[PDB]
Design a protein around this ligand. Structure first.
Ligand SMILES: [Zn+2]
Ligand SMILES: [Zn+2]
Lengths: 126, 128
RNA sequence: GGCGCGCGCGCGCC
RNA sequence: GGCGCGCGCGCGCC
């Protein structure tokens, strides 16, 4: 349906749009685009682990000045290296009303959840 | 012997608070404790945001009597003609007497024991 | 990241 | 007190 914005919960800076969100295995969420990479920084995860289909390499934080709010992790998924965000760190804002809402779990936030597609990235990267 | 009775220990200092046998439930939601033995285990002071709700008149927040703990245990209310303490299971360690196993419950609804309903006749029979 | 629990605390409703 | 929500810190399992 309509498009929404994701704002950092701590500093409230624009993070990304739900239009660029892709769902893996119906439970993990990543964001497509090179623009988004400017929004977060990556750093060594203290306790690296491997679950489901990923290999946890680091945690990502808000790229902003004094913010650095924990946004999620960065992993290895198949032939890719992608960030994985937790809805709990962001504020969802309806673009046409300014109405903001907070979700604790991805399952409680109902929007168009488009599945992650490897062919969708090799088309934008090649 | 009844091997369902449980001890309630202050979560912060581990001191004995009371037994589940002395616990009475008001309106299927609020839990209070019977007897003076329990009255010696806590202290109280006026509540910040309180008073009227349900059939209660929140008259104070109660804490663990141990001067080196003072853990929050609940509140004291005016219920009908009585003045009673109301406790939150979230503040205690549940220890099963028969096996010593300790458990932590965040909600009364999760703690399963023989829940005896509060009854004024009981209150009275013990006052005279 | 998902799920779960713990510790400390704030706010609303009754 | 019950119920809901949020803030900060930590742990377990995958
Ligand atoms: Zn931020
Ligand atoms: Zn204590």
């Amino acid at each position: 349906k309509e498009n929404k914005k994701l704002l950092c919960r701590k500093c409230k800076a624009l993070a990304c749009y739900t239009a660029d969100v892709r769902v893996i295995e119906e439970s993990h969420y990543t964001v497509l685009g090179d623009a988004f990479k400017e929004c977060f920084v990556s750093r060594p995860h203290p306790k690296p682990k491997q679950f489901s289909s990923f290999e946890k390499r680091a945690k990502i934080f808000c790229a902003r000045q004094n913010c650095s709010h924990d946004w999620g992790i960065h992993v290895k998924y198949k032939t890719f290296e992608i960030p994985v965000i937790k809805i709990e760190s962001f504020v969802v804002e309806d673009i046409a009303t300014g109405v903001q809402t907070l979700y604790s779990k991805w399952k409680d936030f109902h929007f168009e959840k488009i599945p992650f597609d490897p062919a969708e990235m090799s088309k934008l990267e090649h």
